[PDB]
Structures are given as structure tokens and as C-alpha cells.
Amino acid sequence: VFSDDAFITDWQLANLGPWEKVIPDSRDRNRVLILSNPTETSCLVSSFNVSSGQILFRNVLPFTIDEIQLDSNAMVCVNSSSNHWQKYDLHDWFLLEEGVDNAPSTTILPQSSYLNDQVSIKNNELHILDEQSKLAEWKLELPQGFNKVEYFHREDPLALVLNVNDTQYMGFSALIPVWQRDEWLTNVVDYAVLDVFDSSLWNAYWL
Amino acid sequence: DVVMTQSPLSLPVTPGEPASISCRSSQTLMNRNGNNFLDWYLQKPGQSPQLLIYLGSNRAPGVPDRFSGSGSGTDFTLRISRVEPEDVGVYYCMQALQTPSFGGGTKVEIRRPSVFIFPPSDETASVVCLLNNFYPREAKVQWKVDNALQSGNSQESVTEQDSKDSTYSLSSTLTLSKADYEKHKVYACEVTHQGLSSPVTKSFNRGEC
Amino acid sequence: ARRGTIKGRLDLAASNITGFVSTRTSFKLYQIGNFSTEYPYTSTTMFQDDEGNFEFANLPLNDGVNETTYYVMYPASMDFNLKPNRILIEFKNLENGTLQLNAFKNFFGREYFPSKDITYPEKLQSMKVHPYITVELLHKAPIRSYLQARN
Amino acid sequence: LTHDGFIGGLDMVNKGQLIWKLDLEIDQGVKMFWTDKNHDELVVFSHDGHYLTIEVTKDQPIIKSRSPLSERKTVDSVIRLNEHDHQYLIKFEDKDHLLFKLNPGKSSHIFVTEHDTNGIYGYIIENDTVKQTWKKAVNSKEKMVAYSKRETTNLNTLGITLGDKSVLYKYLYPNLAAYLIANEEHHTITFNLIDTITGEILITQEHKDSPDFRFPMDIVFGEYWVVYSYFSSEPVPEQKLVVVELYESLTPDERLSNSSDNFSYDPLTGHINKPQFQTKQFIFPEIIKTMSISKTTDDITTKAIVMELENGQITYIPKLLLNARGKPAEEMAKDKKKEFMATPYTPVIPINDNFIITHFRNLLPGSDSQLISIPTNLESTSIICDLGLDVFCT
Amino acid sequence: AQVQLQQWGAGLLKPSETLSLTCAVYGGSFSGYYWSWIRQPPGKGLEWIGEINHSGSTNYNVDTSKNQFSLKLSSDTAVYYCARGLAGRGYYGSGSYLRWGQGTLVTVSSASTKGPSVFPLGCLVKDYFPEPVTVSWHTFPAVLLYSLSSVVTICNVNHKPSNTKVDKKV
Amino acid sequence: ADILQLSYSDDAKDAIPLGTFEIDSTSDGNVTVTTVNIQDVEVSGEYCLNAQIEGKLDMPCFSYMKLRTPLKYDLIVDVDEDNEVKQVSLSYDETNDAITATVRYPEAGPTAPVTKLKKKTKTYA
Ligand SMILES: *[C@@H]1O[C@H](CO)[C@@H](O)[C@H](O)[C@H]1NC(C)=O
Ligand SMILES: *[C@@H]1O[C@H](CO)[C@@H](O)[C@H](O)[C@H]1NC(C)=O
Ligand SMILES: *[C@@H]1O[C@H](CO)[C@@H](O)[C@H](O)[C@H]1NC(C)=O
Ligand SMILES: *[C@@H]1O[C@H](CO)[C@@H](O)[C@H](O)[C@H]1NC(C)=O
Ligand SMILES: *[C@@H]1O[C@H](CO)[C@@H](O)[C@H](O)[C@H]1NC(C)=O
Fold first, then answer.
1. F123 vs C121, C122, D157, F64, CA distance in Å?
2. Which residues on chain A are in Cβ contact (under 8 Å) with C52?
3. Which residues get glycosylated (chain D)?
4. CATH architecture of E4-108
């Protein structure tokens, strides 16, 4: 009874929240890990194919974003009150190690610095520069809104992600637009339902 | 460290015509990539500032097409193609290379007269003369009581121009002690003003209050 | 004090099932017998390798002459059907000094301990725990089959 | 209405294409209501105290009005009062109540009931003022965990009928609420069925089977029955459901009260009839995060208690399976008195993969989520949606 | 304009004590921008950079709480504004401050607060301390104690620092 | 031992006393309430009640009712396993023609059964 209308009637939308950190993946280079949706007790760690949409998996980790850092990759997460720590593999959410005494190490996730390296924006327009011999290949007109450049990969699978409006993300590749995502719907508080629907006697006999 | 100079300190311009403001810096603002790191700000009167141009040549979201910027190195220029009475307020530069300064303060003043007088309150006494909706911006307010002047305790307050008609408004207040005040019968606020022709006086006795 | 470590391994080896996601299977432990901590211990782990090893660690333990502690494991998944589906695990402090671990094979909806008046009652099947506890898929229906087939 | 200021319209068919989106500037939304029966305008309350009036059109809507409340404080919650009087009761954090009469939308006492983790309070609205009426506050070590009201339901049949054609006259009194008190220092869970106009308790029922209090607890209130869920260790360490059913009298043919001819009952005196009840408990494998009951145009089909688990999977079971007055299926045989198609007791409820909605969907629904049910025509079918981090409908 | 900043702080300070102000964000992406404080002293000027980062990288001419999204400042009379700036460079920031805060007023004076009395005529206000008083259902600059008058062309005078709520008709 | 004071209040003015009861621990594990004194006064209208046991018990408003002077109510005190007055409620019982006091215990719940380990399936099959 299900297989006819398995996916036809079900209506599921995936919301990842406003992205806080985008970490590249050492293997399968067109893949990233997104830390998003902070709160007082947990955050949402997801994996994301960057040349498409197609969220791969999501997990609600019970650590704040500032407690989640790389190794010295392996994504060490360390509580601060106690020293309960968990090392989780990238590219598969395997609990590589668990412990209570000491964390192995951490490195602070670096800031972008995408200016002075690869980007210059002057005439309401975005130019991608080589580091040296700045011939300014792959220029693109800016969108209407523009906040920042979330992610940028310069090697062969070129991918670029722009945080265009406050909650919208646009993804380009070598530049043509490839995908577009919106997380305006991250938390629904209340609802209301709107319905849509259609729209002497002898003279009656004759008509 | 870096010092920013704005050329016109006040620039009244009629609506419809182009306007321009210039900005100069001691050091160079030319980044290695080609980012300029100069911003242009507008503060409406009694408001938080707004962003107009945000990396030396770009244009911020939610801004008209009228505004534009240009320049490089040590010189920069903002230009409004068409001026409208909404575009009134203070205009500021900013440099973002090292420790921003906000050097500026240009004061576009696009103004290149109803008379009211209100009675004293129930308690001291305070008479207020209101010059409302006057364009010329230039008035002196004086008082007359039993043909005798009263200059002291003459406190004035002038509001900034409107966004639609850009006509100034002001008020003047004479406060006297009740014992001092009631000794005299007939008061009058007298105004010499540019928009009208001959100075005008509005008078009240005790009357209703 | 001393703490105990349950090892285990869901196989996923005899079958060709290798395209799984590894976030849709979660094992849980709970504590049932003679705890004194003001709250029973409770934990939730995940896989460690492609082979499917899972492991608990730093589990509390009662200490005495022969005092035992009982945990219950809830192997669960959103893709497969796992065979035992609840496992009773016993830690015993032997008087020699070594720590004795035993496993069993319960299933959902039976009491764990007998009623204290039945003489020589039916006992749960012992399960081999020396290398690791071996949770296994159902032989007949490895997949969960949410979708009823029409016609 | 999202958690930030954002209204949007989702097409319930066509896989949720976005018809229109409006961006407010409220910086948090707290509640949303239709202003009148005409279903043309919305009123939206903000966290900081503003209220907005929005005109819903076929095209992109327009925010026709924004204005502050009388008192600019942070808003905790809003209750819709009687439809025609266009009143709202606004509870500010710092626990201050404001009666609000917005616009025409272009003794007849009114009673309200508020609940906190400290207890159930109740209020009376008289002469456009609010007055505290009673209080049921918990002790220092107790903490109320679950609370539910009696949803209004269309009345189809007045009594459940037995084999040998006798009828039990199910208990139908509208002003009831149910709640759970979780007590440490005895490790007990108490169920109470309060009469909300006066404040009588009328039922207490305590469980001492080492409840956990760290795993989610919930209650739902039907037409004439209550079902609540909690975790427990003693019989087996497994999720547990408990169902109580309320009848006017347990003798097979009796209206001990509910004189229906001309009596014109007065509930505020306390003259009403009091219930009798029958209760059962069932064991469930998986931890139930939250619960709801489905709705239809006429409430004929079975109520289909619908549950959201910890995994995010959603499963419903019909109310016929959760049968009080059940027997172990040995005493159901050749028991002429029982019912038509009398279901047996069957305490252990196994999970059925056919009823698991979200067949293969992940559906991470967040920590704060709502299960809602929308009626439709074609009365066999009802729509259920899960709102939260992930929005889903079926 | 959904990502907008809300302020708390103090109105009256005597000389030589610290001034505590607190912004709070109500939008996405707390990590990716530099959040700066700016002063406007009366006297036609602005100057400050009090930059911050999500991983605390203070850059003075500014405490951080990543738990609740509220940077905090503890240091003359002025108006104080939050900000939010582009973060192109690594540890420096790049200005371009959009989404300013509503702005708080801080008066460093010796005397004490005084509530506003109302004397209708339009509506007039006698000596009150500190600034500002907001008339509601036209408003001239205050004149130095401070007195404010308002024209009718009715007088719900509100004063938060003294908590004065007065209603009057012209 | 303990004395419970019952008093209806006009919702602004003051608590007008309406009676007193005593809660004796008669058996080891069964408390009993006896009516030491009830005060007959003319009452009518919507009032909110009050309960106090001096020392450790004060309910300011346990119920709100429309009283009429031939009071015909049962004061139901509600206790727990370790005997202590937990919640007081007042109900309408038709045939009292006075106020009498009753104790109510929490009526322990179902504890539904589960499949058991059978007997001596060791040497017989
Ligand atoms: C990501 O998307 C690209 C293009 O659709 C595809 O080639 C690649 O295989 C995807 N990644 C994974 C892990 O499937
Ligand atoms: C770290 O452990 C403590 C233990 O009480 C807990 O309160 C805290 O929430 C944990 N940290 C996080 C980020 O949850
Ligand atoms: C951000 O705002 C712009 C202008 O209102 C609008 O296009 C949209 O809301 C966002 N931008 C894009 C490209 O969608
Ligand atoms: C727990 O301890 C008590 C006393 O030591 C004992 O009687 C009881 O049997 C123990 N529990 C179990 C499940 O054996
Ligand atoms: C001594 O320890 C061994 C394992 O090292 C164990 O097999 C044996 O049972 C212990 N002795 C006794 C008496 O149990």
C-alpha cells in the first residue's frame, strides 16, 4: 500500500540553519563539514556536498561551537567543565576515540583571510585573482545582497559559496550558478492554515 | 595615524542637480589585491548612521541608485546624481586599512513663517513663542511688556530641517517668576524675519489665562 | 576504583551491505540491578570502524566480596533487524581479584530475573563474550522493509 | 512563523513550494492568530512587545500595521479569548497579565487556565479585568512535567454499547484538564484530573516503579479518555503508556446523573456529577518524545494516537488497541457481554513497520517540535505535520 | 533588516568609574564578522574601533559571550553604538559597518536624577534629569538641568531613568 | 495533633473563619480527620477559600466556589504514603447537610504484567 505513494505524498524539507563554520574535507575534495545552528547546549554538525545541495548526514552534538576544534583531520570535541572528550572521524561519523582524562590536542579554526589572497571587489563586481600575476580571471557581477564569501576552493573541482542575503547561500562552479539554498525556515514557532477552494416558473422550465 | 580631510564643510545644493563630496588621506589606501578600504556614511538627524558605499567603489544593499563612489590611493569622491530632500544629514568618510578614524562631517544644507504665542502655565510662569514652518532659517525673537523690553531668560531651541519640505522650525521661551510675572498686564512676542517683509508682533493680555 | 568495558561488533561482513550511513545505528546501555549513585548509569555509543566495532568504557562498578552489577544493552537500528534485541550483561567481583563478565540473550517483553520461588527455572542462553559480543542481523529479513508492496 | 521574524506560505501539495515569504522586523515571533472568522488578516505578536497586523492576499502580503502594546515588556505567551469580542490575554515574563482588545478586525463569566512548572493557576475575566481565582502549587521537591486540556470534539455517540446491547454512558463534561506531578524524595509519578472551573481533583493515581525523570514524559487528553507516557525500570526497563477511560457509572445501564431534560447545570456551584474510571498500562519498546491525537471534519474515525520518537521516526497506533476494560483473550472467548469485535488486552505493544511514517526519511526534528493534525474532507483521511527544525507533512 | 542589535547599559555615572554596555544580536552568523563599538560625543564627531571576533581577538584604538550572542564593553559623556563589520582580513577586520545598533546615551554628571513634571499650554516639561524624555501621541532639542517643549500641530511623557509615566492633554 | 483551619475569603478583604478540624494519626499508617468545631454563619455568593495548618501548611486559594448557606460539602484532604497533608479540595456531596472531612490516598496505579520465566524447563521438554 506504501510503495505507490512512498515519496509522492511525503513532504520533507531539510533545514541546516545559518552556517557558522565550513571546514574542508581532506578526502573527497568536493565535500565539506558544516557546524551550524548553535544553542546553549548543542550544535548541528552536518556533511555537505559542495558541488550540489544534497545534505549527506546531520548530527546534533551536545557541545557548544567553541568547544569543537580540529586535531594536530579528526574533529576533537572537548567539554570544559569536566574533560570528557570525543574524537570523531571526518568523512564518516565514526567515534574514533572517547576519554575522560585528557584531550589529545586542539587547533583554533582559522579565520578566512580571503581578501589579500584570491578576491577583489571594486565596481559592485567580484574578481577572482591569482596570488601572483593577478590577471583577474573569472570575474562575476555581484548579487543584489552580499554579506561574505563562505567557502572557496581554487584547485581542479572549483567551487565557490556566497552568503548572498542574510539566510541565502549561492553556489557557483567553473562562473555559472550551480545551486542555491535557503535556510530561512530553521525554527517554526507557530502556524496557521489557509484554505483554497473553488470560486414565472415556466420561464424557469424554459431556461 | 591616518588623517582624513573632507573638502566642503557645508554644501547646500538645490534638489535636482548633481552633488559631490571629496575625501583625502595622508597615507595610501591601495591594498595589494586592489581593495580600497574606504567607506562613506550618512547620518540623518536624530538617527543612527547608515552605510552608503562600503569598499571604496561598491554600493551597499538597500540603497538608491543615485549614489556612486570613485577614486583610489589617497583621493576618493562620493557623488549624488540627483539630490532630493530626503538626502539631508551629515556625511562622513572612513578608512578601514588600520584603526578606522571617521574623519569628516560634511553638512549638506539644502536650504541655501507661521507665528504662534502660547500663554503661561498654571505654575513660575513661562511664555513660549513658536516660529513654525519657516524656510529662511534667520530670525531674532524679542519680547515686549508694557512697552518695556525683557531680554533675560530668553532660551531658544531650533530643530533640524524636514525631509519633505526642509523648512526650519524654532521656539523661544521667556521664563519669569510668578511674583515677577503678574505685576505686568500685556505681553507680546515680536519677530523680525526674512521670509516676510515687516516685523510682526503677537500680543496677549491675561484674558483667559 | 575499577571500571569495566563492554566490547561488541555488529558484523555487516557476511552480507554485502556496505553502503550504509553509520549514523542510523545506535547502541544504548542502562543499569538495572543494585546501583547506588542516585541515578542509574545510562550511555549511548556508535560505531568505531567499517568492520562495525562498538565499545563502552568507564562503566561504574559495585565493589565488595561478590557484589554484582547488571546492565542491559538495547542494540537498535533504523535500517536492519538485529537478532537478540536486548542483552543482559553481568559484572562480578570474584574473590580471586579478577573481574568476571557474562552476557545473555533476552528479548523484548520478558522479565530478566526469576520470581525467587520457582525452583530451577528456565535460564537465559549464555552468549560468548571473550573476543567480543556478536550482534547479528536477522537471517530471513536483513532489511527493515518499511514499504508495503501494492498488488 | 519562524523563530526569527519571517512569515511564509507553504503549498501543502507540490512538495512544499514556497508561495510567498514576508520578512518582518520583530526580531522574534511568539504567536500568530487569525483576526476574525473571515480568514483574511493575521495578528502577529513579537517578543519585545510589539504587535503587527498583516493583510494576507493571493499575492505577496502587506504588513499593514505595526504598533507597541500598552506596556512594553517581554511577552511570554498569548491566549485567544472569545472570537467575537476580539480579546487576547497576554502573559509577560515577570508573570504579568494584560487584557488586550485590539480592534473590530477590519452572569456570562469567562474563565482562563495557566500552567507553569510550579502548578496550575486559573483566572477569571470580569469587567475587562483579570482576577486570580485559585492555585494548585507543587511542593519544593515536586515539579509538574506534563499538562493537557480537553479538546472540543463533535459528539457522534453518547455511549459505548456492549454485547447484549447495554450502554455505559461515557463521561462527557467539558471543563477538565489532566496533568502529571513528578516527585523526588519518593520517586513517584502522580496523575491528576482537575476540574478547571472550581479546582476539584476528582482523581489521583500514583506510580512507584522507579521512574527516571531524565527521559521525556507526555500526556494527551481525548474525548473521554487520557493517555500518558513515561519511562520506568521496575517491571522491565522500557517505555510505558498508561490509559484511563472515564464513565458516568460502571454498572452496564445507568445514568446515575446527567439528567438531560431541563436541568440547566451550574458548574460553578460544584453540583456536577463525578466520574468513575478504568485504567490499564502497556509497555512500548522505544522512547516516545511527544504525542498528539488526530483530527477530522466529524470525529468519527478512530483517534490514532500519533507519536514522535527519539529517532525522529513517527508512528501512530489507533485508540482501539489501547483498550481499557480489556481481558487477556482467554476470558474474551464466548463472553457475550463484551462488545462488537472486542479487542483483547495484549499489554506488550510491538512496533509495526507498516505504520512507521517517514519510511526512509531521516527527519531530525529538533529539541523543540510540535505535532499538529489538520482535518480534511474525505473523512477517512487526516493530515499530520511535524514542525521544528525540519518541517514535514503527510 | 532582520539582523539588528539591542542594547543595555547605564545612564548616570559619576566621575572615575567604569561604564558597562551590552549589545545582543538577533540574526544569523555570529561567526564571520567583527563587532565594533563606536562613540558619538556631542560636538559633531565620531571616533572608536573596539573590534572583536568570535574567537576573542580584541583590536583597540569588549568581552565576548559566544553562548548567548552578546558582546560586552566595560571602560566621557556620549552616545554609544554597536556595529557589525566585514571580516575579509584575518585578524584586522575591514570596516564596512552595516546593521548599527539603536544607540544608548551615557551622561557622566555629578548631580542626581529628577523626574519630568508636565505643564500643558503645546505640552511643556520643566527641569528634568538626565536626557532624554520622549513625547508621543514637533519635538525641539533640549536646552540646558534640561527643559523640553513640544508643539501641537497628546503628551505621554516617558522617562525611563527616573521611571516617570505621565499623561496630559494640551 | 495538627489543626486545619478552613476560612472563606471575599477575594479582597480578609479571611472570615468557617471551621476547624483536627488530623489525628489514629493507626500507625492511617490519619483521620475529626471536626473539632464548625461555625454556622450566613453565606452566599462567589468566594475563594483558604486553608492553614499552623506551622507547615498554607493554601491561600485551593478552590473558588459559589456558596449558599446550607453548606453540603465534603472537605477532601489528600495525603501521600508518608502521612502529610498534600492537597486540600472541597467537593459537593448531596446528603451531608454540613461540612465533614475525609482523607484520600492516591490509589496506586496499574503495574501491568509481563511474560515470566517458566517453571522447570531444564530436564523436561
Ligand atoms: C557530489 O555531487 C557531485 C555532482 O553531483 C558528484 O559527482 C559527487 O559524487 C557527489 N558526492 C558524493 C559523495 O556522492
Ligand atoms: C560538560 O559537563 C557538565 C557536567 O555538569 C555539563 O553541565 C555541561 O553542559 C557539559 N558541557 C556542555 C557543552 O554541554
Ligand atoms: C536579498 O535581498 C535582495 C533584495 O531585496 C533579494 O533579491 C533577496 O531577498 C535576497 N537576494 C537574493 C539574490 O535572493
Ligand atoms: C539488591 O540488594 C538487596 C540487599 O543487598 C538484595 O536483597 C536484592 O536481591 C538485590 N537486588 C537483586 C536484583 O538481586
Ligand atoms: C582466579 O583468577 C582466575 C583468572 O585469573 C579465575 O579463572 C579464577 O576463577 C580465580 N579463582 C577463583 C577461586 O575464582
1. 10, 10, 57, 68
2. none
3. 127, 258, 262
4. Sandwich (2.60)
